[PDB]
Write an enzyme that holds these catalytic residues in place. Structure first.
Site, PDB file in Angstrom:
ATOM      1  N   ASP A 163      56.403  27.057  42.200  1.00 29.90           N
ATOM      2  CA  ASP A 163      57.789  26.689  41.887  1.00 29.90           C
ATOM      3  C   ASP A 163      57.864  26.403  40.379  1.00 29.90           C
ATOM      4  O   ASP A 163      56.853  26.032  39.721  1.00 29.90           O
ATOM      5  CB  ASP A 163      58.143  25.437  42.706  1.00 29.90           C
ATOM      6  N   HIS A 186      61.166  35.023  35.733  1.00 31.00           N
ATOM      7  CA  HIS A 186      60.451  35.876  36.710  1.00 31.00           C
ATOM      8  C   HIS A 186      59.310  36.583  36.102  1.00 31.00           C
ATOM      9  O   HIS A 186      58.181  36.600  36.673  1.00 31.00           O
ATOM     10  CB  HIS A 186      61.352  36.848  37.466  1.00 31.00           C
ATOM     11  N   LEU A 193      38.237  39.026  47.101  1.00 30.31           N
ATOM     12  CA  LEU A 193      39.253  37.969  47.387  1.00 30.31           C
ATOM     13  C   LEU A 193      40.263  38.585  48.357  1.00 30.31           C
ATOM     14  O   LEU A 193      40.667  39.755  48.197  1.00 30.31           O
ATOM     15  CB  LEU A 193      39.955  37.750  46.050  1.00 30.31           C
TER      16      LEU A 193
HETATM   17  N1  LIG Z   1      56.584  43.791  34.189  1.00 34.91           N
HETATM   18  C1  LIG Z   1      56.477  42.727  35.231  1.00 34.91           C
HETATM   19  C2  LIG Z   1      56.841  43.220  36.665  1.00 34.91           C
HETATM   20  C3  LIG Z   1      56.596  42.252  37.644  1.00 34.91           C
HETATM   21  C4  LIG Z   1      57.631  41.452  38.158  1.00 34.91           C
HETATM   22  C5  LIG Z   1      57.336  40.512  39.130  1.00 34.91           C
HETATM   23 BR1  LIG Z   1      58.579  39.385  39.895  1.00 34.91          BR
HETATM   24  C6  LIG Z   1      56.029  40.407  39.568  1.00 34.91           C
HETATM   25  C7  LIG Z   1      55.008  41.190  39.066  1.00 34.91           C
HETATM   26  C8  LIG Z   1      53.673  41.025  39.542  1.00 34.91           C
HETATM   27  C9  LIG Z   1      52.401  40.846  39.998  1.00 34.91           C
HETATM   28  C10 LIG Z   1      51.162  40.635  40.553  1.00 34.91           C
HETATM   29  C11 LIG Z   1      51.217  40.195  41.849  1.00 34.91           C
HETATM   30  C12 LIG Z   1      50.066  39.952  42.532  1.00 34.91           C
HETATM   31  C13 LIG Z   1      48.875  40.170  41.916  1.00 34.91           C
HETATM   32  C14 LIG Z   1      48.788  40.598  40.653  1.00 34.91           C
HETATM   33  C15 LIG Z   1      47.537  40.788  40.165  1.00 34.91           C
HETATM   34  C16 LIG Z   1      46.842  40.890  39.897  1.00 34.91           C
HETATM   35  C17 LIG Z   1      45.367  41.116  39.295  1.00 34.91           C
HETATM   36  C18 LIG Z   1      44.216  40.693  39.974  1.00 34.91           C
HETATM   37  C19 LIG Z   1      42.911  40.859  39.506  1.00 34.91           C
HETATM   38 BR2  LIG Z   1      41.370  40.292  40.397  1.00 34.91          BR
HETATM   39  C20 LIG Z   1      42.808  41.533  38.322  1.00 34.91           C
HETATM   40  C21 LIG Z   1      43.910  42.028  37.607  1.00 34.91           C
HETATM   41  C22 LIG Z   1      43.669  42.722  36.408  1.00 34.91           C
HETATM   42  C23 LIG Z   1      43.924  41.851  35.192  1.00 34.91           C
HETATM   43  N2  LIG Z   1      42.917  40.790  35.071  1.00 34.91           N
HETATM   44  C24 LIG Z   1      45.212  41.835  38.098  1.00 34.91           C
HETATM   45  C25 LIG Z   1      49.948  40.851  39.941  1.00 34.91           C
HETATM   46  C26 LIG Z   1      55.298  42.132  38.087  1.00 34.91           C
END
Ligand SMILES: NCCc1cc(Br)cc(C#Cc2cccc(C#Cc3cc(Br)cc(CCN)c3)c2)c1
Ligand SMILES: NCCc1cc(Br)cc(C#Cc2cccc(C#Cc3cc(Br)cc(CCN)c3)c2)c1
Lengths: 213, 214
Positions: A10, A27, A111
């Site tokens: 939140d 967001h 994970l």
């Molecule tokens: N341009 C932003 C668009 C957007 C809007 C909104 Br609302 C949400 C998002 C999102 C996201 C998101 C959701 C869940 C998981 C992730 C992730 C991740 C992740 C996990 C690992 Br482990 C490794 C990486 C690579 C970077 N360290 C990335 C990213 C993206």
């Protein structure tokens, strides 16, 4: 060992306002904070991370669409992705994309990341009760055979480690009908930090609370 | 004014309070009882409709025997007494005293006091589900008519005001399988004060924190 952490994320709208920006900017910064937390948990050996999109305040379908472009990268990172919540009235194209992303990653052994989309803890219980009630009507189950173990097998996340720790950012001190059944014995950690500012030191602070416990 | 109709309290810290004193557990339980009387009186005097108490130490049937000695006093302070929890294997003498004490005070119009005895939030949900499952087996209920509102009408305390505020004393931050369904929207207030020391000013402080945060 903290094995399964759940977070009520939140404060995005409040953060945006404090930065003198429109809601959308909150967001976007909240999304960057999701990436950082998921990275931290995968790097620190947490088994399961469950994220509840929520703001003190259809937007839920948008939030899940935004995750679509992150799936190829989760998968490369050995993350198993699940959406929990009532997606049965999302548009059919988004339902199919959820189903494809879950199936893609279902074999992964890193994970497990659960994203709660249109989820509620009372809803979760009710869906498990409806299942049990279908079995009773079919004559497959006696009312007196229903017990805690059996209900447990019909609520979300029953195959994962018990929730050890629930974190709520943003300053409110409530569960807001996030997990109910599953949090019977979890440590509850409340911080005034707004979700977009919640970083790796904040997550570590919460993990310390649990270790002190 | 404080806005709270139903407060629920996890009364932890009696063992720790006695250990701090160099005293055995019994002394913390006696001080914890004195704090119960004080809390019950404070709630009755501050317009709360319902107070629900969970006796916990981070013995059960003896806690409830002990309460029997207090029933005439509660009646005299116009408190309506109810026990919540699975008392079905407490034997019959206890069960009967429980029944008579609820009958005696059911007519009272002041605070409603619910004392958890052998209570768990998961158990409470399961008993409600069993009542719905009996109705399905009688042919009285369809599985797809079961919604939240209906399961809500089957859990303990469904006929009272929703729980607005849960206080846990003693310094742990956890629900410990006290009320789950019922606390979905409740304010959670944790304090390091140990139960025997939790007094009217501490109770006032929790209600005013709920009023300010709501
Ligand atoms: N341009 C932003 C668009 C957007 C809007 C909104 Br609302 C949400 C998002 C999102 C996201 C998101 C959701 C869940 C998981 C992730 C992730 C991740 C992740 C996990 C690992 Br482990 C490794 C990486 C690579 C970077 N360290 C990335 C990213 C993206
Ligand atoms: N003194 C040790 C006996 C003992 C041991 C244990 Br363990 C537990 C108890 C208890 C208790 C109990 C449980 C529920 C309610 C109450 C009470 C009260 C009460 C409420 C109002 Br209103 C007013 C008063 C006395 C004010 N003249 C007293 C007391 C009592």
């Amino acid at each position: 060992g903290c094995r399964h952490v759940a977070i009520i994320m939140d404060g995005n709208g409040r953060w945006a306002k404090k930065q003198g920006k429109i809601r959308a900017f909150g967001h976007k910064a909240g999304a960057k904070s999701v990436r950082r937390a998921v990275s931290f948990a995968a790097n620190n050996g947490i088994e399961a991370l469950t994220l509840y999109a929520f703001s003190s305040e259809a937007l839920m379908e948008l939030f899940v669409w935004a995750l679509d472009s992150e799936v190829k990268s989760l998968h490369r990172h050995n993350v198993r992705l699940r959406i929990i919540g009532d997606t049965s009235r999302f548009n059919s194209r988004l339902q199919e994309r959820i189903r494809k992303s879950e199936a893609l990653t279902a074999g992964n052994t890193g994970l497990t990341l659960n994203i709660a989309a249109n989820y509620g803890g009372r809803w979760d219980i009710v869906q498990g009760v409806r299942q049990l009630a279908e079995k009773v009507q079919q004559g497959n189950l006696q009312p007196d055979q229903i017990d805690e173990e059996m209900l447990n097998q019909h609520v979300c996340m029953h195959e994962l480690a018990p929730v050890d720790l629930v974190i709520r950012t943003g300053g409110e001190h409530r569960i807001s009908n996030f997990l109910l059944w599953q949090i019977a014995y979890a440590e509850l950690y409340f911080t005034d930090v707004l979700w977009p500012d919640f970083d790796e030191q904040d997550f570590e602070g919460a993990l310390n609370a649990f270790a002190n416990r």
